[PDB]
Amino acid sequence: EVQLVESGGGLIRPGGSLRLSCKGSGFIFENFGFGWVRQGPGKGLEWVSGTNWNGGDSRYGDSVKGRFTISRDNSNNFVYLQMNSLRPEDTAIYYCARGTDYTIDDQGIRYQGSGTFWYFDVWGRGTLVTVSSASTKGPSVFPLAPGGTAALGCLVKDYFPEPVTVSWNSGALTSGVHTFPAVLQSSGLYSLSSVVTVPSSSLGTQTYICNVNHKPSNTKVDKKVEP
Amino acid sequence: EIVLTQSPATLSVSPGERATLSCRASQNVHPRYFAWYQQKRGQSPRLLIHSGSTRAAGIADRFSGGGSGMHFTLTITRVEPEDFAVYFCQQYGGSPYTFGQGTRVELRRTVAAPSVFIFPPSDEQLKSGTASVVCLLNNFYPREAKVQWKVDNALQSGNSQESVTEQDSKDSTYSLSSTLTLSKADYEKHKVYACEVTHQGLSSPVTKSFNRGE
Structure with missing residues (x-):
């Protein structure tokens, strides 16, 4: 029942843009943080971007900071990833991934229901994004x-x-x-x-x-x- | 940024045996802020361990995680046949969160020397300005193998590309190709074209070759 469906891949020109979408279903979407992980040609995993349950806290990767924007729509169970000024090195399989359903603050207090993007328990099939000229x-x-x-x-x-x-x-x-x-x-x-x-x-x-x-x-x- | 280095790059193990993966961090990471994933061929990553030592949902108790500071480990007590995959460590004690380069756990079979074949460029291709020579390394183990091209004894460099298959599901062997790409004019100026293969199953480097035209 628990599913994460990506949509929005394909061929992008160097300098172009692309918006990824991920539809969550089968769970309380509102409670979880979300993230995107890419996998380059013959490579491993790279943490790209992550946002928490209310989309208030959002971090990015070093190579993508300032170019990408992450966002969510809890009333419609969507999480998005805007990608501007794409380069060939960005060519990878992008996975939508579900973070936690809780979080801990700097005081060591654990907040149930307020998920974040530390690690990911559910992964989509991923979508291929090819950036070439x-x-x-x-x-x-x-x-x-x-x-x-x-x-x-x-x-x-x-x-x-x-x-x-x-x-x-x-x-x-x-x-x-x-x-x-x-x-x-x-x-x-x-x-x-x-x-x-x-x-x-x-x-x-x-x-x-x-x-x-x-x-x-x-x-x-x-x-x-x-x- | 915190860099995660996993070792070994390839752990060759037999079923039923113990397997201990290792991840090294460039900086100190809190013990309760670490994760491991499994990655089968053609599939998406799957969470094994989170928060350092905690098994994820539906993970067999043969998997275990531990570590602190700059050294973390993942242990499979007895590897089952469905445990052969790539494994990634991941830190989230410090942003930006980072993964490891991965560790492929492969089925360790007996050593098997490769069959070696060489293919001259088709005349059809030669009639179009370029010449490609291909060396085929069929069914071998382990996958570590050196392929060296030679043109009139002079060994080549910077003009070849290798490709290797995923480990076979039926006999656990690998196949490798090497492609030497020359301009036609360069191909015309030489007679001997050779592919020298060095492998563990070979007492001495095997050479397959041909004279251009003959």
Whole structure:
């Protein structure tokens, strides 16, 4: 029953803005503090912003201070995060997270029902925020032509944005397939490759096709990988 | 700002064994102001311990937390198969609140040498000004592995990119790719293209190579 649904991700231009939203339900929203935690490319967690039950106390992270604003609407169970002057380094998965339902003051007195943003017991599925200045580009699909077995694959090079999906033989081939995580290149474009190991004797008979699809650029490629 | 450094970066453990994670703080942190999280692949973080030693909701009693000052720990008494994930420490004794870099608890299997393959650039790609050579390291353990490119014996640097799969769910192995990207003109001026792999399961560095054109 207890849910936190984010909304408001996507592609942002350097210098642009974005407002995140989080709808809480299944609990007394009024009693809890809230926060946002981001997760960068191949990285860990970074505490971004947090506000307490009545939105009166609100702190931010060093790298985001002065650019971001957090706020809430208890009568409608929403918590927002305004993001101004975004930079490429801000590219991360943003999680809406529920803080405590209590707090302690400087005197060591614990206040029940007045939550804050120390730690987070409930986390949303998170939303991806991509901050790049790149135009949409379709990838170039290249063949990776072939102990006791043989390896072949496809090179999916220079595309934007994420993601692409790769399959072998329209989905008929799964065993041995390793589709690698994309790597961001110095140009801001992504590249990846998908490989599969097969019996070295089947090369002359069985045909192998890789199915590459990149929706944002309207690009589908079916490449037949041969010796 | 308070910096949190976790160690080790990777704890390779077998099921049923004891696991003790460590977090080090740049400054003194109050013992009752610390938290730990678990992070499975593709999932959101989940609170394990809060306020230093208190287990969160629905957390198995095999998890425990302790520490003070600049040294905090998380202990799994006996790791179950559903305990393999990344773990984050987090301080909130001082603002701005900070996390650790994370510690991946991996399934420790037996050592397995990688299968190694090398792929020359397609002619199709060469007909477009660039040349990419790919070295494939299939199914190996542990994941620590050195890949070195060489072009006419001269070993390369600053022009390659590695990518590694998540640990396999069926045989607990890793696969790695390395991509050497050259300009066509550079690719034309050399014959020998080699990928030298160093790994623990190899008594000596394995080399797969090819002569351009042949």
